Structures are given as C-alpha cells and as structure tokens.
C-alpha cells in the first residue's frame, strides 16, 4: 500500500487506468485524422491542423490523469494503444462526424468513471473529474457538432467547394 | 498511383509505415518512465521530466516521418503502439540503461532504412534519413551513455543518494 | 585544368550546364505563366504572384549551380533558353498541372544529376544535390499537388468561381 | 480584340515582342559575363557583382514591357532567348566595351520603338518609352563609356594590376 | 567495446585518428605562415592575420573529428604533430601556392575517409564528412585559388608593390 | 642580421624557440587530456572543458612568444609538436598530477630563459618573462594544486562520486 493512499479504491484505480488509455486512443485517433488531411489527394490544411491541436490535447488529457494516478498512490499500468478504425477518412465531414462519435464515447467513460467515484464515496476523484474533465467534454461535443451543421449544410461531402471554404473561413 | 510520387519504392514506402510505429512505441516507453520516477516511492522529479521530454520529442520524430511519407506520395497505414516491455523501471540507472538499448534498436532500424533507401536509388530519402535522423540517434546514444556511465561510477543503483544526487545536478 | 579542380569528371561538369539550362528553362515557363495570368481576359492576381515567385525562385537555382561549376573548377556553357510550350494556360487548373509536370521533369534530371555523382565518387556534388535541390523539388512537387487537388474539388477550371476563389483565399 | 485595347497598332504590338525579347537577351548576356569573373582564373568579384546587378535590372526591364503589353491588351509571344556570343569575356576591359555595344543596341531598338510609336500616334506608348526606357539607357552607355575610359587609361586590359584595382576602387 | 559503439568499424576509427593528425598539422602550417608574415623584412600583417584564423579554424576542424570519435565510442589516439616543410614562405604568393596545395592535401584525404565510410555501410560518418567537411574544403580551395590567380596577375612574387596592395585591398 | 636586433643573444633566441615548442607542447597535452574526459566510459563534462581552456591558453602562450621573438629580430624555427606521454589519463584526480608536473616543468624552463637573459643582460627579456608568464605559472600552479588537495580530501579517485561532485561544484 502506497504511504499516501486514502479513501482510494481499487476499482477507482482501475478505471483511471482504462481511461488513460482511452485517453491515448483518442490522441491517436486524431493524429491519423490529421495527417488523412495532409494527403496530395485530400488536401485540407487547416482539417489538418485541427486534428493535430485535438491530438496534442488528448495527450494532455492522458497525462494528467497518469499524475492523478501517482498522486492518489495508484499505480500506473498501460496497455497497447489501438490502432484508429479507419485509415481513410473520407472527407472533412465524415471526419468530423467521426470525432463527435469518439466525443460522446469518451463521455460516456467519463461519466461512468464519475458514477463511480461517488459510488465509493472518493469527492475528490468525483471533483476531479467535474473540474478538469465533463465541461471539456461538453465543450468539445458542442463544437463538433456545430461544425458537422455548418458541413452538412453548405453542401459536404459532396461539394469539394463547402469543404475548401469551411477549411478556409472555420478552421483557418 | 499519387500525382506527387516518384523514384519512390514500395519497399520504402512500408519502411517508412514502420519506422512510424517504432517511433511512436519509443515515445510510449518514455512516458512510461517518466510517470514510474513520479510514483511517490520513487519520486526523482528530474528524471521524470528527462523521460516527458524525451517522450515528446519522439512523437515529434514519428511525425515528420508521417509528413514524410505524403511528401513523397506514399499512404500512411498505423498499426497498435505496444504497451512497454515493463510497468516498473526499477531505478533511474535501470531506465537509462533501457533508455540506451532503445535508441541503439531505433538506431538499426534507421540505418537499416538508409540502406533500404540507398539501395533503392532514393537520394531524397537517403538524405532526410542522414540529415534528421543519424545525428540525432548518435547524439541521443552517447547522452545516454554519459549518463549510465556518471550513474555507476556514483554507485548507483544501490546508492539511493547516487541517484537523488545525479538528479539534482546533472538532470535539474 | 583549373587549378582548383578535384574528383570532378568531366560527365558531371556537362550534366552541370544541361542542369543550369533547365533550371533557366523552369524560370523562363513560370515567367510566361505568371503574365499569362495578368491578361485582362484572365485576370487572377495571386496566380501572376505565385507564378512570377517561382520564375525568380528559379533562377537562383540556376545561379547556384553556376556558382558550383566554378567552385568545382568547371566551365560554364550557356546554351539557348528554348521559350515554353504553350503561349496560352488555358486556366489556373491547367497551369498548375504543367507547373506540376515540369517540377517532375527537373526532379528526374536532379535524381539522375545525384545518380551520376555516385558512380563517380563525388560526394560533394551528390550532397549538394541533396541539401539544396531534391527537398526543394519534393516541397514543391507536393504543393503544386496539394493545390491540383483542391482547384479540381473546387469545380476548376469550368467554375470560373472556383479558380477566383482560390485565387483568393490560397494563393493571396 | 480585347476589351482594354485602344490605339495599340498590331506592328507597335509585335515591336513590343521584339524588346521583350532583346531585354531578356541583355540579362542571360550579363549573366554569362558575371559568372566569367567569378572563374577562379579570373576571380574579379567586383565586375562579377556589377555584371550580375545589370543582369537582374534587364529582367526587371522586361517585365515592365510585359506588364505593358497587357496593360494594352496586347498579347505576349515570347521566343527562345539566344545564348551570348561569347563563352569566355577575356578581360574586364573587353566585357566593358561588349557591354556598351550592347546597350547602344538595345537603345537603337528602343529609338525605332519610339519612332513607331509616334508614327502610329500612340502617345502613351511613346511616352512610356521616353519615360521608363531613353533616360535609362543614356545613363547606362555613359557609364560604361566612362568605365571603359578608366580601365584604357589605367592599362588595361594588359596590366591585371589596372583591372585588380579598378575592381577595387570604381566596382567596389 | 564502447556501450555507444554501433556501425563504426576499426577502419573508421584509424581513418578518424589519422584525420584528427592532419587537421592539426594544416593548423600548424597556418601558424607558421602567419608568423612569417609578421617577420620584420617581410611585414604583410593581413597576410599573417590571414593565416593565423585559417590557423584556428583549422584546429576547430580537428577538435569535431575528436568529439566525433567519442560520439561514435571510438578512441582517440594522437600522433606527434609534424613541423611543416618550409620556415621561410618566400613570399604572399608562395605562401598562397603552399596553402592550396595543403588543402587539396586535405580534401584528398576527406574523399578518402568518405569513400571509406560508403564502403562499410556508415551513413553516420558519410553525411558528417559531407555536411561539416566536404563544401568547407572546397570554398577554401576556390578562395585560394581567387586569392593566387589575383596575385600573379598583378605581378607578385617580382612586384612587392602588387602583394602590398593585395595586403591591403584583398586581405585587409 | 635582422634591422631590428638589439641586445638580443643567440642564445635568447634558441631559447625562446624552444620555449615556443614547450607552450605548443603543453597545449596538446591538455587537448588529449581534455578530450578523455568527454569519452563515453569516463563523461566529465567540466573536467572536458576546464582542459580545453588551458589548451587553448596555451596556444595564446606560445603566440606571443613567436610575436615576441619577431619583436627582437630572432627567427623563428618550429619543432614537431610531441605526442603526450598518455593516451588514457586514468581519471580526474590523475589528470589534474599530470597537469601540476607539467606546469611545473614549464616554470622550470621559464626561470631558465629569465636566468639566461639576465646573463646574457637583457632587461627587456627578462621583463617580458617576469611580466607575462611568471605570476601566470605560479597561479596556475596554485590553482591545479588546490584541486589535487580538494579531490584527494574527498576521497578521488576511488570514489567516482567525489570525481563527479568536484566536476559539478568547482569545475561547472
Ligand atoms: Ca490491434
Ligand atoms: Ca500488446
Ligand atoms: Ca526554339
Ligand atoms: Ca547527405
Ligand atoms: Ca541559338
Ligand atoms: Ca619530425
Ligand atoms: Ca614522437
Ligand atoms: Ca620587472
Ligand atoms: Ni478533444
Ligand atoms: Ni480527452
Ligand atoms: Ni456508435
Ligand atoms: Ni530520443
Ligand atoms: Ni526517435
Ligand atoms: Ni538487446
Ligand atoms: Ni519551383
Ligand atoms: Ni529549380
Ligand atoms: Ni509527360
Ligand atoms: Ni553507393
Ligand atoms: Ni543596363
Ligand atoms: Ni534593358
Ligand atoms: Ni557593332
Ligand atoms: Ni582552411
Ligand atoms: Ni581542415
Ligand atoms: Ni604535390
Ligand atoms: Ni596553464
Ligand atoms: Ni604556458
Ligand atoms: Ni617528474
Ligand atoms: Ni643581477
């Protein structure tokens, strides 16, 4: 039992863990997006370097919960990071719409992870959780759908034109 | 075939997808060390940011590879990032010591590439290897060796002053 | 023999004015372009800009190998600059396939240039081959895709919209 | 006919060409002589630097005339730009006095430009040739008569001590 | 065998050494130069300032081929440093004469060393004599041939007029 | 007889001669000392840098005893420059013993050359020794035995970490 442990459980730990790297999946994720939109043949500079930005942020997401890890006195175990589930992306949209998915899916292992902070009585997991996490979420979500509206609505995938001034105006 | 690619190989094109991976493992094993040396049971906060510091620079690595590869009209394909051969790093001389025998193993890849590419009649390739990878590899080699070698000559690992002392003074 | 000749054969110091040629050749198409594009029944400012840039980007090219033909203790022959292959570009789209086409045909004639280099045991000319050409060409090659790609997605060149537009917003 | 032109005759059009031409062959001119001196055997730094100036102002001449040409909805044709009559310019004296019957060539192509011009009645077009184009070339023939002048009375072309010093003293 | 050793063969490492000699030895022929120079019944002071920075960068030369050495773990072994082969120079132009004659001396050696490295496979130590050796050797060897062709033809050795003004306007 | 000589023995002028020899030869056995401990088995940064500065002191030593030997009208005769004695110069501790006996036998042969030119009555050489290199040996002197005292007082060289705590809190 580490020194510095307290009012931390095991199943608590556990889930930080699994989180981490869920954390590091979505940073990945987001790389391959990213350079999809660095492709001669997709072309897209500033999708491009959205995703980055997000991929960067998602590594930070990881760390920090890797510190929470080590601050409570749990100890850190990682596990392969998987592969993203596509290679081509499609299009601006279709990436988009992807993200906002893998969004909502992180969410949800956020909130699950909060549900049980509280189950084990743990306010300062639970506090953690509501302060640096759930509103980014939230925010995140947010934006990315606002982003999947304005594609759908001047015209993509279809209309290389919408994609081109969306990156351009929007992202740039 | 992309518009942009020329006296590229295939052969090269697939060394080019690994060496992506390798490199994004070599920044896994170094966040994994850094966050073993800021486990309050271990606890040397210069280590720590040694390994963070290394870990971003190999993803830097990975992705200039990335960027290389649609350069030359190749087609980025990731595979799963391996989780580290350990959890627990055992001492800051143990982690550098694993720190030196991966960057000799990503040394041999990129060597192995060079040879790929000369091979192959790829004089870009052959340079953008030579120019932003062999120095680098060479540099990081002999740092790391510096480094076991002061840790030793100190005592270390058994000198538990050995290694809060070379933190001190030579990571901080 | 020039006093400050060294490992230079005579096959490299030919294949050095063919090259100076071509690279006043590259000038002298992107000079035509660029006032094809200041017509008054044309009329896309940032394609004049962008193609007058290259012109005199390329003729620092030409200058420089000049300069290493007498650093080598070679002797420049000028030939003929042949005047492009067409008077009229047809469009910003087709423009920048040619611009595209002809980065390819100087880029084979450098790889050969380096290739030549090698056989000959001239590590100097081949890395002055890689260092200050064949990025170059690489970097170039990809733009030139990149904005290939985007002006085909954008509905060019029958949307004269679409060649103003990115006229605007990539090229100003 | 385009929708700009007015008062532009097709032979002042065509004589427009024609200097277009005549100017870009002044540049590749002053371009071979520059890298003359630049010749280890040669090695006048100055005379390069002054001969590689000349040859950028004659590129800058040319694009004003093709920036006339349609400003007046005439329609640019460029020709191949014929290589200097010489390989090797001998002396800086000898490159001096190449270089003023150069421009009193180019001024006398200019002069029937103008005689044309007011011939046909185009008073913008003759002024633009008094304007950008007379004055200019006065003032380059009287300084490389004055040039000339100097290297004569100096010793040139047999004393290389004269053409040392003249580079140092006049070009530098 | 070094901990950092990988690549490098023996071959290497003596070439490497050997280099390390004559980098210090072109140092100490430079030293004695300027020194010459600085003789009372000879008075070039730019002369002998000349010579003594080629004297230093000279060492700088050899103090990278030592760091290099320890880089790659090879070992560094010192011979004794030869005197040069002359006390008295003659004169401005024999000195210049002498000194293109050691630098070519010394880029024959480089090329060697380099075509050594290609042969055993040591992309490392190629790109290192290309990138910090190769252009520097042949900049030097151009400058001097410049600064030899000058002085004859102003008449040095004969005239002690041409190689005090050469001191002045060249060196100074 | 040089137009400067006055006062000036031949046997000053051997002396100082071989004075020059001995500067230059103090100089290179400070760069191998220097360079040793940059080796990846040995890794003393500060030590590396602390012999590199007396190298290159002695370099300024032996430069302004050829200055002064011109200064007087003596000619200057160089020597081979000596290997040094070692190779592999053991540790910190021993190198800083290896440094004191050499300035030793340095002050040596400077108290000679001042005995010879007071002899030989002359006062200018003798100031100039007294002036320049005296107090500057017995300061150096001085200096290398505190540093023996303080590593031998901590326990060097058998203790690695006395030899690295020296480098960082005198030598750094
Ligand atoms: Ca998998
Ligand atoms: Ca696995
Ligand atoms: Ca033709
Ligand atoms: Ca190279
Ligand atoms: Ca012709
Ligand atoms: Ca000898
Ligand atoms: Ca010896
Ligand atoms: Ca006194
Ligand atoms: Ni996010
Ligand atoms: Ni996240
Ligand atoms: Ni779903
Ligand atoms: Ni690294
Ligand atoms: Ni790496
Ligand atoms: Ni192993
Ligand atoms: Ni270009
Ligand atoms: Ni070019
Ligand atoms: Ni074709
Ligand atoms: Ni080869
Ligand atoms: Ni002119
Ligand atoms: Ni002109
Ligand atoms: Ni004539
Ligand atoms: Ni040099
Ligand atoms: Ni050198
Ligand atoms: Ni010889
Ligand atoms: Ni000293
Ligand atoms: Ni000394
Ligand atoms: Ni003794
Ligand atoms: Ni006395």
């Given at each position: 039992?580490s ?17 981490i ?9 987001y ?5 999809y ?5 997709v ?20 760390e ?20 993203p589930?596509?290679?081509d ?9 992807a ?16 549900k ?57």
């Open positions: 039992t020194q510095v442990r307290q009012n931390y459980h095991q199943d608590s730990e556990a889930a930080i863990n699994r989180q790297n869920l954390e590091l999946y979505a940073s990945y994720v790389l391959s997006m990213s350079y939109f660095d492709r001669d043949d072309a897209l500079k500033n999708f491009a370097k959205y995703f980055l930005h997000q991929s960067h942020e998602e590594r930070e997401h990881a920090k919960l890797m510190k929470l890890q080590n601050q409570r006195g749990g100890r850190i175990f990682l596990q392969d990071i998987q592969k589930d596509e290679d992306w499609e299009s601006g949209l279709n990436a988009m719409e993200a906002l998915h893998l969004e909502k899916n992180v969410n949800q292992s956020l909130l699950e992870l909060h049980l902070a509280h189950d084990k009585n743990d306010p300062h997991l639970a506090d953690f959780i509501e302060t640096h996490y759930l509103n980014e979420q939230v925010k995140a979500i947010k934006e990315l759908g606002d982003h999947v509206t304005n594609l759908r609505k001047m015209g993509a995938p279809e209309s290389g034109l919408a994609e081109y001034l969306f990156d351009k105006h929007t992202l740039g």
